[PDB]
Amino acid sequence: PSVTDMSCEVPACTHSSDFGGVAIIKYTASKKGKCAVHSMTNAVTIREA
Amino acid sequence: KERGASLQHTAPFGCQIATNPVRAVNCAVGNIPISIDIPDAAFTRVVDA
């Protein structure tokens, strides 16, 4: 499915050894479906795939 | 016969005085420091709100 109308926000984050950062993203897509997620900067990692 | 005014009237800041035991109560002077250790259970993650 496609994706559009992408907005990002961080209510709070806490640099730590754990997944202390939480980010809420508003998205709009064409249809129901799976989609991969990644961070292209090595300085940050995402638990979810 | 000549006792005079009791301390419950002559006490600055009007600290009410009792007996058995003798205490001075309800006088406003200075301030109080309070330290509260609050378990995280009451705390709610921002996303929840």
Side-chain angles (χ1 to χ4, degrees):
Chain A
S2 84
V3 286
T4 181
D5 314 329
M6 272 77 109
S7 90
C8 162
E9 166 270 357
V10 181
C13 76
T14 303
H15 58 110
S16 68
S17 271
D18 89 9
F19 307 114
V22 297
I24 317 311
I25 275 159
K26 195 82 209 161
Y27 76 102
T28 294
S30 60
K31 55 179 167 52
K32 277 64 167 139
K34 297 305 309 195
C35 185
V37 54
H38 177 63
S39 178
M40 57 310 297
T41 178
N42 88 319
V44 167
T45 313
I46 186 69
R47 153 160 42 164
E48 307 90 56
Chain B
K1 184 59 57 58
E2 298 45 39
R3 322 212 290 283
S6 153
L7 286 158
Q8 160 281 359
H9 321 259
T10 73
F13 315 113
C15 214
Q16 278 52 97
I17 42 163
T19 170
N20 50 71
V22 160
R23 307 130 279 160
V25 199
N26 325 283
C27 38
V29 175
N31 37 0
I32 302 90
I34 293 93
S35 71
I36 309 307
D37 185 351
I38 167 63
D40 76 323
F43 283 77
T44 61
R45 294 181 320 310
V46 299
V47 299
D48 317 321

